[PDB]
Amino acid sequence: DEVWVVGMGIVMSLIVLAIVFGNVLVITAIAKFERLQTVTNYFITSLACADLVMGLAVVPFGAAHILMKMWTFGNFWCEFWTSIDVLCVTASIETLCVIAVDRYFAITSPFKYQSLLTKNKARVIILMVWIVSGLTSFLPIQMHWYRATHQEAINCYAEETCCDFFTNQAYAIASSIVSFYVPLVIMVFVYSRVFQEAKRQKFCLKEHKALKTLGIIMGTFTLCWLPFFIVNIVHVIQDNLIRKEVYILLNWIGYVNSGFNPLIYCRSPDFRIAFQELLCLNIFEMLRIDEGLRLKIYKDTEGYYTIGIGHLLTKSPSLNAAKSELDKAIGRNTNITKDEAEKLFNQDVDAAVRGILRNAKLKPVYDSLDAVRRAALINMVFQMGETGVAGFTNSLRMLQQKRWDEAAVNLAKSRWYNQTPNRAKRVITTFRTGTWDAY
Amino acid sequence: DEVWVVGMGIVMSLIVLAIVFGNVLVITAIAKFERLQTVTNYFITSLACADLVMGLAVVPFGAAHILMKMWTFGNFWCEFWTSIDVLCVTASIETLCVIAVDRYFAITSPFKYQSLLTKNKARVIILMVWIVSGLTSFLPIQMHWYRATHQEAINCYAEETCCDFFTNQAYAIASSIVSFYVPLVIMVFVYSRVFQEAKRQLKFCLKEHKALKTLGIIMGTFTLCWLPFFIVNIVHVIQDNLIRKEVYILLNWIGYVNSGFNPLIYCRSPDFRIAFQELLCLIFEMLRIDEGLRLKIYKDTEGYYTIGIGHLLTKSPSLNAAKSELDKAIGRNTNGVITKDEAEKLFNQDVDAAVRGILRNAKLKPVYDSLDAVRRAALINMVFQMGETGVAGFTNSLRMLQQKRWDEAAVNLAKSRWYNQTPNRAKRVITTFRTGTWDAY
Amino acid sequence: VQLQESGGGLVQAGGSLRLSCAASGSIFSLNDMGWYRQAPGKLRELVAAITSGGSTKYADSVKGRFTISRDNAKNTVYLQMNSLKAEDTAVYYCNAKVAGTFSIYDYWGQGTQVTVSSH
Amino acid sequence: QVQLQESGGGLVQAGGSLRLSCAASGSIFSLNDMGWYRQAPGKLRELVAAITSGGSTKYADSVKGRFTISRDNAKNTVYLQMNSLKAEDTAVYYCNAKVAGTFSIYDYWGQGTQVTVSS
Ligand SMILES: CCCCCCCCCCC(CCCCCCCCCC)(CO[C@@H]1O[C@H](CO)[C@@H](O[C@H]2O[C@H](CO)[C@@H](O)[C@H](O)[C@H]2O)[C@H](O)[C@H]1O)CO[C@@H]1O[C@H](CO)[C@@H](O[C@H]2O[C@H](CO)[C@@H](O)[C@H](O)[C@H]2O)[C@H](O)[C@H]1O
Ligand SMILES: CCCc1ccccc1OC[C@@H](O)CNCCCc1cn(CCCCc2ccc(OC[C@@H](O)CNC(C)C)cc2)nn1
Ligand SMILES: CCCc1ccccc1OC[C@@H](O)CNCCCc1cn(CCCCc2ccc(OC[C@@H](O)CNC(C)C)cc2)nn1
């Protein structure tokens, strides 16, 4: 079995390194770049510190404990080793939901995705999260509240060679609830409305994709620790069928989660550019999703000189004629900024909404639609013009008649649905459902 | 001598009687009257339900124990009686601490006194507080986690006729902290910043700003009533039994009679006081304090017809001229009476005057920008009351104010002809001039 | 806080119209809303009230002929009177209830008049 | 989704004074950092003054003592008071907003506004 010993040594040692390596990579990136100084990043920084202290002060000694099949560091470190262990786990689950609540108050604020907290206010919150979860994790252990009274524990408590965590089931459940389930339940509830409010006002916008990353951070965390925490309240409510080979194995599922977050953060483009440098390497929203933004002059799907969020600068092939009116609209001679591309969009959209109301074939249709399917109509008038949207009266009156499923089968036969099918299907599917499920 | 035992029985019966009476009265008002359906009052309610449970379920049995010199109800009620006792004290401070935080999110929002909570959200928070408070009170006692291990505790736990609350040193501290001190100092901290953001955004003269003071008194007494008990609890647990039990039982009864005190602190509010009386068979905001508000034509100190928030109607003495100007100002035939919406529509217009009329008045514009925001209003007040006619007509203090000689500027205006006609409003604004603060409003 | 009505016109009997009201100074989300009318020689009367949660109450004399509604995004409340009768002629006022610490407060707009014209 | 609008530029003789002002909308202006940049002809876009949401202010060395950046959160506006003007200060001046989102901070610029000085 000496093959098993050395082979597990390399895996555990690899695990310990991946934790320390990736988490320090996060702490460094948020500390370097000013672009990354956000309140959410400050919570992620402390979240990384929890995983970092895991990889330094916890996972190693637990790796040494297993392959040596015995505890080596005396009794004092034993009480401390498991207090730091609980301190890290409780601080993460609390911090993960101080994010979910901070994300909630933000999506109900003028700038969705903008935290309402001061950078120094966010610091204090993190300071108390560690100050509180430290009290509720060290005091019960340093004061012996966890301890059991069966001789098998009283002996292990006496020998400085045994460091198994025998606990009276009062501790085992009480601490399991206050420090895991209670924050976990709040988190899953609070952040769920966050996701809902995000589409009411899927997962295509940049900061929307960021919230699904915050979700995946929470998600993998619960999935890695819930088996450990589930089969330990049953293990006390029903007498033990949980053999110790399994309890420490499900706990190591919780240990490796500390290496997961740096990987997950590579879903944000903002974090990858930081990592790569560190290693020497709503109607308006709906249309930005499927029109894209480009700050120069480019050829579109039909070959015309467009710019920004799908603004046709001209139909002529001469780029001289494209610039000719590109600078006629900005104000200067642009020969445009992201802010210039923005106010040309807000002025092109209103032109398409008045262009809907000055059409007697579209206005009665646009009048009877909800907020969402109106936006679906304006997306067609934007991409085409009111003259072409007056085309399929068949579909135009099917929408008015509130025969959504019928109107959705006719629209998918238009030439529109096969020259830009991926975008067409998104406008037709929101016609069908009245929701934003596709955007 | 049995004279003492029947004397306290009468005194204790009334204490229980007062508690139950005044708190059924409070709960009734907030439920009957539609004006009182504030989220702040839904907290007032459960605060009174926590006081009602004490009056019924707790306090009387603690009275029987003292007079009977023993516990006669068995050990089941004995552990139930106390788990209820601590449920009412923890569910309270946890609500008095939610009020202080709710009033903080109210004074940082446009309407300075509007809760950001729904009624429904307000009352799931109440349900939560009671659930949570119960599980951090009933569970550690019904599960015997409080139990001490010295012999006296053990012998008292075994007598059906002994119901002292012997506790282990860990529970006594971990309970007092989590159930009392933590919500106490969050409250004392968060609410003190509610009080100053009020005095900042302009003491205790506005109606609602007295309501905040009324809440502060509720907390203020609650702390003082329950704090001596909770301090001597900690000094005994940590050191040794230097606290007697008759002093511990008296300091405890101070927090007991607190349950009957809130309903009369509520008589400070005109809202509860008129509600109880029916149940029982019976610069903008600176000038609004100093002017008042009247919905009918009245005569000011100097005899001029005025309406609304100190809005002059005419220098003429013919009431018909006052009504005629008022109808032209409001745009309908008032016959001398207007509405509050119209009165402060005029007031908003009339304040705009008092600032533009000092933008254009001789040497009295440089003194305006020579002073700070809290003294700018203290002079816009004098203009509003007297125009740029008279406040420009005493340059002795105007130069004194420009030269920042305020201790002098304040003695001159104390002799001014204006001082002797409106003395109290004269010195509130004189102090606003001298101390450069909102201390008088 | 301040209220701002709009939408009063002369209508033949059986016709229809809608009323609007903008508001400032509170969180329109949290305030109950409703319209009141007062015809000369008649006292002020509740016509329709939309509570903050969205419940609706309508006067019996106008039930099934009036729809109060709100849009908390635009800070406004709407009333679609249809099937107007000669009796409905009155001055309509916009009411907003804004809760304070211990009590709830009333606020009204300046007013609008509706008058149904017989033949 | 936020917008910026400069105002208050043009000409003035040397030693003159100007007050450029920028109004922002789309975010909590209280929690945003604010700053002014200028692009003189034949030069690159340089910072002149920045105010952080905490109040701290740095200035371009060329404009230190002459310009004062300041903030008014009540009106969602930030002010550059250009004093003791010199002909070198001739540039299109820009208003910048730094709004923090989830994982990153976003930059937001105004259209710009011209300031010509005469020796
Ligand atoms: C509002 C807030 C209140 C908060 C709670 C206040 C904290 C105090 C509670 C701490 C607490 C449970 C903790 C439960 C988990 C909760 C923590 C989770 C924290 C969150 C993350 C453990 O308390 C600890 O018990 C240990 C015993 O092993 C002991 O450990 C060490 O002791 C040795 C040297 O100290 C040493 O040999 C060795 O090292 C350990 O043995 C500790 O010294 C002792 O403090 C109390 O446990 C209760 O203790 C009671 C003893 O009488 C006991 O009652 C029994 O006796 C009764 C007649 O006497 C009888 O009538 C009952 O029938 C009977 O059962 C209860 O059954 C038991 O449950
Ligand atoms: C129950 C709540 C735990 C917890 C709460 C909050 C936040 C975070 C929490 O956890 C964090 C984990 O990272 C803890 N790591 C495990 C200890 C460190 C440790 C592991 N090893 C391996 C030896 C295991 C053998 C053993 C088997 C049974 C034992 O007794 C069972 C019972 O006494 C404990 N009950 C639990 C099942 C709930 C004791 C030891 N020896 N010492
Ligand atoms: C530890 C914090 C308690 C608490 C927590 C949360 C919220 C609210 C809390 O409080 C509730 C008050 O309503 C106090 N009620 C208890 C007395 C009610 C009572 C009276 N009686 C009989 C006579 C009591 C005389 C006596 C004196 C000392 C005793 O010894 C106990 C010893 O442990 C002292 N330590 C304590 C200070 C923690 C026992 C009895 N038996 N029970």
Side-chain angles (χ1 to χ4, degrees), chain B residues 65 81-82 85-86 89-90 163-167 171-172 175-176 179 226 229-230 233 236-237 245 248-249 252 256:
Chain B
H65 193 303
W81 170 62
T82 45
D85 177 1
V86 296
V89 173
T90 62
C163 185
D164 295 359
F165 193 51
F166 280 114
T167 57
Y171 168 85
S175 59
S176 294
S179 285
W226 276 112
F229 163 93
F230 267 103
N233 167 0
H236 154 52
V237 166
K245 292 178 180 53
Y248 163 100
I249 204 161
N252 189 9
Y256 266 53

Side-chain angles (χ1 to χ4, degrees), chain B residues 119-138:
Chain B
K119 288 175 198 173
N120 293 291
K121 296 176 182 183
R123 69 175 68 107
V124 299
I125 288 176
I126 297 172
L127 187 69
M128 284 186 186
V129 165
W130 276 92
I131 295 177
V132 159
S133 275
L135 276 48
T136 69
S137 45
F138 270 88

Side-chain angles (χ1 to χ4, degrees), chain A residues 136 140 143-145 147-149 170-171 174-175 178-179, chain B residues 136 140 143-145 147-149 154 157 168 170-171 174-175 179:
Chain A
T136 75
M143 298 292 277
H144 296 334
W145 303 353
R147 273 165 159 195
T149 61
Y171 182 94
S175 73
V178 51
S179 307
Chain B
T136 69
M143 286 308 299
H144 283 67
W145 304 352
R147 287 286 186 105
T149 73
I154 294 174
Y157 301 147
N168 67 44
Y171 168 85
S175 59
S179 285

Side-chain angles (χ1 to χ4, degrees), chain A residues 159-306 308-311 313-357 359-389:
Chain A
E159 175 141 345
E160 311 190 32
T161 298
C162 174
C163 177
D164 298 309
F165 203 59
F166 296 107
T167 68
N168 67 47
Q169 28 172 327
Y171 182 94
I173 285 201
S175 73
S176 187
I177 280 175
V178 51
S179 307
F180 179 81
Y181 291 100
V182 169
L184 160 55
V185 171
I186 286 167
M187 177 195 76
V188 167
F189 176 77
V190 169
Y191 203 66
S192 60
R193 220 148 146 208
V194 176
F195 270 154
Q196 193 229 326
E197 298 291 318
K199 67 183 179 183
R200 189 175 85 184
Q201 309 193 18
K202 40 173 64 177
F203 293 0
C204 305
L205 288 182
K206 172 170 185 280
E207 295 273 302
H208 274 130
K209 279 180 170 278
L211 295 180
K212 186 184 127 218
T213 290
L214 285 182
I216 292 171
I217 288 299
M218 298 157 181
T220 66
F221 177 93
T222 67
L223 300 188
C224 298
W225 281 115
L226 197 53
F228 168 84
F229 281 106
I230 284 179
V231 300
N232 82 17
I233 56 91
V234 304
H235 165 264
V236 311
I237 197 166
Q238 274 73 267
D239 312 275
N240 320 319
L241 187 278
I242 288 67
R243 52 149 170 164
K244 298 185 198 105
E245 304 92 326
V246 172
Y247 160 98
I248 80 172
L249 174 73
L250 276 42
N251 190 356
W252 271 82
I253 297 174
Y255 281 9
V256 304
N257 175 212
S258 313
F260 271 64
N261 288 359
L263 294 178
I264 293 169
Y265 292 135
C266 289
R267 284 170 40 84
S268 166
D270 277 309
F271 280 30
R272 280 178 302 192
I273 301 311
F275 295 153
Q276 294 170 353
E277 195 263 27
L278 281 187
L279 302 171
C280 300
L281 315 174
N282 183 356
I283 175 69
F284 310 95
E285 293 171 346
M286 174 191 178
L287 272 87
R288 170 55 223 279
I289 288 171
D290 44 5
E291 288 291 338
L293 176 131
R294 169 82 293 179
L295 294 194
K296 321 182 176 187
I297 282 186
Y298 72 107
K299 156 190 142 89
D300 69 350
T301 169
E302 293 234 5
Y304 309 156
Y305 289 62
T306 48
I309 317 183
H311 178 127
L313 286 177
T314 184
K315 336 292 191 313
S316 152
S318 186
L319 207 180
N320 295 325
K323 311 195 177 175
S324 66
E325 315 185 17
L326 169 65
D327 49 82
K328 219 191 64 182
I330 303 296
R332 60 185 148 102
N333 208 326
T334 63
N335 301 108
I336 56 173
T337 70
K338 185 271 301 173
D339 292 328
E340 282 304 332
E342 283 187 347
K343 60 169 98 77
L344 269 74
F345 179 86
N346 204 163
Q347 297 168 327
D348 267 0
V349 177
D350 74 22
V353 192
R354 312 152 337 171
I356 290 171
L357 301 191
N359 198 295
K361 267 167 60 172
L362 316 176
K363 183 170 186 189
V365 195
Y366 177 104
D367 285 314
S368 45
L369 288 173
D370 68 6
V372 176
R373 326 159 194 258
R374 273 179 176 178
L377 208 174
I378 316 185
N379 187 304
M380 298 186 296
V381 179
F382 189 93
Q383 171 191 3
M384 283 172 159
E386 42 79 2
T387 296
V389 174

Side-chain angles (χ1 to χ4, degrees), chain D residues 25-57 59-63 65-74 76-110 112-113:
Chain D
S25 88
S27 60
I28 316 163
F29 180 95
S30 179
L31 301 163
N32 293 172
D33 281 358
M34 294 289 156
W36 284 93
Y37 295 75
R38 73 184 181 186
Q39 197 201 17
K43 277 164 189 188
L44 301 70
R45 168 165 321 109
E46 69 177 353
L47 183 129
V48 305
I51 195 166
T52 64
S53 76
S56 210
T57 56
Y59 289 95
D61 285 326
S62 36
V63 313
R66 302 189 291 122
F67 300 5
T68 285
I69 194 162
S70 61
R71 190 183 301 221
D72 177 65
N73 294 308
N76 290 2
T77 63
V78 56
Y79 296 94
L80 183 58
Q81 181 58 66
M82 315 184 39
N83 282 358
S84 307
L85 293 212
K86 314 191 305 224
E88 283 249 68
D89 299 311
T90 304
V92 170
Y93 284 51
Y94 287 102
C95 166
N96 177 25
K98 291 187 170 193
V99 188
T102 305
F103 302 138
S104 56
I105 305 174
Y106 295 92
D107 269 296
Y108 279 113
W109 296 94
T113 188

Side-chain angles (χ1 to χ4, degrees), chain C residues 60-62 64-73 75-100:
Chain C
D60 273 322
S61 71
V62 303
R65 304 187 301 105
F66 290 73
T67 74
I68 182 73
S69 88
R70 48 194 304 163
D71 180 83
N72 309 313
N75 281 280
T76 71
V77 51
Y78 305 122
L79 183 120
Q80 283 277 165
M81 35 187 63
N82 62 317
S83 159
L84 296 173
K85 186 44 198 140
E87 321 167 330
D88 283 332
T89 290
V91 199
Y92 290 80
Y93 310 93
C94 173
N95 195 19
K97 298 183 174 302
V98 183

Side-chain angles (χ1 to χ4, degrees), chain B residues 2-204:
Chain B
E2 185 217 55
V3 56
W4 165 63
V5 81
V6 73
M8 291 303 97
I10 297 302
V11 175
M12 287 174 179
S13 272
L14 302 184
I15 290 175
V16 162
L17 205 60
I19 294 170
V20 177
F21 175 90
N23 277 294
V24 176
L25 186 55
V26 158
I27 294 167
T28 302
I30 293 166
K32 303 297 141 221
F33 302 116
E34 226 184 37
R35 271 102 179 191
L36 307 182
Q37 301 276 129
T38 74
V39 162
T40 305
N41 285 342
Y42 289 24
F43 299 155
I44 287 288
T45 293
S46 64
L47 213 64
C49 296
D51 292 330
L52 204 65
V53 181
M54 294 271 283
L56 301 177
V58 171
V59 180
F61 297 87
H65 193 303
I66 292 177
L67 304 154
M68 282 192 294
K69 288 287 183 185
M70 43 72 81
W71 176 266
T72 206
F73 318 89
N75 272 331
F76 177 99
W77 185 240
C78 160
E79 273 195 355
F80 213 82
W81 170 62
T82 45
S83 49
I84 275 174
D85 177 1
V86 296
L87 165 60
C88 289
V89 173
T90 62
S92 292
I93 194 65
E94 280 197 5
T95 294
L96 278 177
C97 173
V98 162
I99 290 165
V101 159
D102 169 71
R103 293 301 86 188
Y104 188 88
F105 273 80
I107 198 145
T108 67
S109 201
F111 195 101
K112 280 197 228 164
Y113 322 110
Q114 191 186 6
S115 186
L116 314 179
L117 294 156
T118 309
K119 288 175 198 173
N120 293 291
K121 296 176 182 183
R123 69 175 68 107
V124 299
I125 288 176
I126 297 172
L127 187 69
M128 284 186 186
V129 165
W130 276 92
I131 295 177
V132 159
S133 275
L135 276 48
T136 69
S137 45
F138 270 88
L139 267 170
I141 284 93
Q142 298 291 321
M143 286 308 299
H144 283 67
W145 304 352
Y146 75 108
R147 287 286 186 105
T149 73
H150 65 278
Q151 193 65 41
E152 305 221 1
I154 294 174
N155 295 134
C156 181
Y157 301 147
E159 191 72 43
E160 279 327 309
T161 323
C162 181
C163 185
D164 295 359
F165 193 51
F166 280 114
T167 57
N168 67 44
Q169 325 98 47
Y171 168 85
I173 301 169
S175 59
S176 294
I177 273 170
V178 176
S179 285
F180 180 67
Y181 287 80
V182 154
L184 193 284
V185 293
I186 291 199
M187 188 197 78
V188 175
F189 165 73
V190 162
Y191 202 66
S192 288
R193 273 171 46 149
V194 163
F195 264 8
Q196 210 167 8
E197 266 213 331
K199 176 255 192 73
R200 184 211 265 193
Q201 261 169 122
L202 264 185
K203 204 240 142 325
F204 310 102

